[model samples]
Target: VPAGTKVTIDGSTSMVNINEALKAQFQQTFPGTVVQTDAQGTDKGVVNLILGKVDLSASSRPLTSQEQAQGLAAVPVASDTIAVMVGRQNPFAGGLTSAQLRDIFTGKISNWSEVGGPNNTIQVINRPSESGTQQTFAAQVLQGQAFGQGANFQTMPRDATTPIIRALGSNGISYATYGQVENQQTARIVPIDSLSPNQENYPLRRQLFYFYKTPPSPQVEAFLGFATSPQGQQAITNAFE
Candidate 1:
């Protein structure tokens, strides 16, 4: 209900769905509140928040030690899963194991057929170094190993997710938040070890969080309360699916 309760958010593109849902619901419930949201990769988001450039930061990964010392407090908002996706035209559908995925990203696996796909060259798309998605993938999927040198890794401007998905082709493979690609007919999700992204059994699933300095102001608190409330959670569940 305030005119200038400025709140800026930044983090993983995977959390975009949750951000949109929160913005829509917060604005509708409390008219006249201004909430500005942005995504500049997870690390940058944390840095922005710590520097007092933003009121709150959204992150897909846990905070680092330096961030924790900066009086940052994280609150869980929602969950998302990371999945391997390829262009629908990809001939190697449903053919990669989790280990093989690590190998492909790490530059060990070079061809599609080696992992059960067609006899085509593999084009790997990777997130930027500062991405929480990249951190999660490396920790959970790659088991702390580095990706291959020849992988065509590119960072998205503003940490947007859709552009990465749109950049892929038949020979191209990339990873994205399940919520971003779930409804798309053009991209197909490649299961790892027969575990789909949305399934409970998926190991890549992670909780989304909002990091803030101290308690937010009245208007920001209200917005955050609504986001964690039942209605907000339901909206997130529906929109992400």
Candidate 2:
């Protein structure tokens, strides 16, 4: 590892915790090397990578075909599940069918009582389309369908989890990586198909990927090597769950 080499990473606000944890260990392992990150959504990171402006991009979703055509390679680092969440005050304590979950996000199911909860309008919160978390959910859960365009669907201002967790009031519903809300008291994870998100069988799951151009430069190769090394894997594992 070269002492003065700087590695710049940006992407996936959903990957903030994972990236920060990995960055800390990496810096300690190779002192004087810098790892700077930006939580600008995944699209920005991929765009920067394609434009040769970033060393690597932390992505919660895989690269699009166009991105692949651009010589970018996506290396998956971890698997994660998206937990559908509602606030503690929410009267809904029941799990949802896959169909029901889809309908809620699509605006077809507009009220909690429809799913056996209290008689309140369901507030469907969404992350931005460019957000990797949202893209992952859409790909895995919605089968890549664009979210239904309706007034009931509310997009969060940014990709950070705190705001999404805070926005989920009793009447509100949204999704986050299970790790994001696992220890949070701010919201409750909703089960799907009668299984908790933490369970391996949880339906909404996807891989977290790191993107870089193929024929990785020494710096890129070193980072990827460390990212998948036991130390990097341990940092990621401990940070997530």
Candidate 3:
């Protein structure tokens, strides 16, 4: 640990817990060093990293070919499960098949009654394009399809998680990293194909990453080392669990 060393990280609103866990432990393990983190969404994080504004960018999605061509690099740090959620008061019982889930997000199935629930309109809460969580969900759940833009769908202007989850009042539905919503009193995770996010066969789990320039700076290297270490991984597990 270098004396008075400081590092900055930004990206991926879904990786808030992971970043904070590693930040707390890294600073404690190496006193006099500082680690700053921000949830600026994956796209902006990569942009800032390219601009050399931040040392590291937390990401919930893989880099594109364009980013790789630009000398950007990434390190896989953790696994995250995406939970399809709704307000606790929502009366949508049972589970949804992957196709049914797809239809809902794509606007083909806009009513609860269309999926065996009450005959109320299902308000779809969606994240903006920059959100890695949203990107991952669109890739995995929608299978590369675009999100629908019907009146029932509300795409948030910002990529923040809290607002999306909070907006899921009653008939509203949305998706977020399981760790974030696991303990939310107002939200409940819905089963997909009869499998919860905790199940081994769950399909929504995705890799989390830390993106940096090809030749990482000294502080970036040090922090990455700690985050990938046994102690750091344990801290991450503790925070998410």
Candidate 4:
């Protein structure tokens, strides 16, 4: 890699930690190369890539057929888990069954009491439509069902992970990438079907991907090459831990 070589990455706040870890390792492995990274949600990232605005995009979901038709190629770079979270002060202490969780997300179960919790209404904080995490969660957890509407469910305007996690107030429930919130102090991870992200039985796992224009540029090839190497895989696993 040349000293002046630059690579740009954008999209998927859920993969922010993975992107940063790989960026640092890539720069260290090939001295003088520069990697610029940003988060604009997965949808915007793909758009930017298609528009020739970025060298590569990090995504939490697979490429849509329409996106593939635009000369974008995606490779699975890492595996990730989506964790359901609540405020540390929340009174709901029991784990949720898969059916129970689906009901809550789809608005079928609107109160804490409906799920063996308190009598108060359960506030559901959701990610925006553009979020890759949002799409993956809906596909896996909601089982192709549409998200519930009305006042109980409040969707964030942006796809930033921290803001969504912070909004999981005392009675609010939301989901985020496990890597992003694994060390968070303000929120606690709730188990699904009595299984946590660390367990193989956990249900919300998905693959994270890196997308680049077809016929990749030299810089994209170099960066992605490192991302798939043993050292790069180590960096990715370390970041998630």
Candidate 5:
């Protein structure tokens, strides 16, 4: 890579931890190369990439048709599972079935006892509409069903997973990328269908993508090369899984 290369990245709070790891390595290896990173939601990141505001966009989800049409290319950097999380004090440690999990998010299952927990109401925490994590979860788990309006759906400006996890009450349950909660001692990872999120047997795992223009610059290419290399993947796996 060139000595004066400057690159900008914006996307996915889910990728925040991994991005920090990547940036540190990149800067250490290639001195004088400036890399600016931002953790905007996936949509905004893709739009900025399309508008040529950034050299690369680290997205947690794949780009839409409009983004692809704008000459964006994506590369798989790492894999992450979407885990169902609850406060450690919550009595429900046993895994929930996919249907039951869906019901909880959809507000069909309101009480903790309804899903084999305490006799308290279930609080459903959620990500905002533009979140790639939420989009993937809705597609895989909810199957296009809308979440119950009455449920306590906490939507933040960004996918601030730590804050959300910290805010969970005993009866509250939320979902986030496994990376976000893996090292968090405040919350417990609630299995879905008796399957652990980090396990290969887990069904909710999804790939993390790095999006960029097809005709890459030397900086973009170098960064991408590093991202797919053993070191990059290892960094992500260590932080997330």
Candidate 6:
């Protein structure tokens, strides 16, 4: 808490709720300080950090090796499961094996019954290319395979969660963090590898990060301290629950 402190954050629209939670608490504790946030996707956030345009970059995926080579560093702020979801009205409710999941995202498997559901065309709802959520899902779920680009694959016109969930109409499938979709009235979270995302150490769960330089500035260090403190962790835990 200081009289002249100003902190700017950008990146990972998926982190909007948690960012606001931290901003609200931090700004409250230090009344004179400022914490400004932007909802740009992770790529822009990392770019901002690299270009010295912002103090912190809220990222949902591990920094790429190329990013690390550019002298960026990351601190884990939270861990969340990337849930495979469908519209609540979607009738195809079944668990997917890893291979099955891969095939679905890569376009090899196109029908709901291709896994276990009734026969119907699978509408694949997807995030934008630079979204940290998409980055992590592709890395963890698809490994090195390319994402599907066929007519059935629909990239959300926007990366916002509500719109993506809304696009899931009856036959569409999408992925978002558990925290983002946990309370959605319009979507159903799908299980993978026979494991519910809420279970301990769900594989789809990945670390959400806050990125900065290696030898941090004083403000960055202090904010990092606050973000990992009991208060910060509390804010994160309460963000979705």
My TM-score estimates for the predictions, one after another, are 0.91, 0.94, 0.97, 0.96, 0.92, 0.93
| Candidate 3 TM-score versus the reference | 0.97
Predictions in order: lDDT = 0.77, 0.85, 0.89, 0.88, 0.81, 0.85
| Candidate no. 4 TM-score | 0.96
Candidate 4: list runs displaced more than 4 Å: none
Off by over 4 Å in 6: none
Writing each residue's lDDT as its tens digit, candidate 4 over 179-211 gives 777875858889898898878879999999999
* Residue pairs with backbone overlap in model 4: none
lDDT of predicted model 5: 0.81
User: What TM-score does structure 1 among the candidates reach?
Assistant: 0.91
**Model 3: CA > 4 A from native:** none
Clashing pairs in 6: none
Off by over 4 Å in 2: none
In the range 1-241, model 5's lDDT, one tens digit per residue, is: 7888887899888888778888877788889988798987776788788888889888888777888887888998877889889998877777799999899888888888887777888888888876788888988898989877764665655567877786777778888888667765868988877888868888787888989998988889899888788876766665554
Candidate 2 is scored at a TM of 0.94
Off by over 4 Å in 5: 230-241
lDDT of 3 by residue, 39-132 (tens): 8799989999999999988999998999989888899988889999988888886688999999999999988998899999999999899999
Ranking by lDDT: 3, 4, 6, 2, 5, 1
Q: What RMSD does each model have against the real structure? A: 2.0, 1.5, 1.1, 1.2, 1.9, 1.7
lDDT of 1 by residue, 109-177 (tens): 888888877887788877787788888888898886877664355445545566777777888888878
Q: Which TM-score value belongs to model 6?
A: 0.93
For lDDT, the strongest prediction is 3
lDDT per residue (tens digit) for residues 1-241 in model 2: 9998788899887788888888898999998988888878898888889888999998988788998998999989888888989988887888899999988887788988999988888888899977898887887778765676666678987877788778887788898888778875878888899999778888888888899998788889888899999988987876675
Worst 10 residues of 1 by lDDT: 150-159
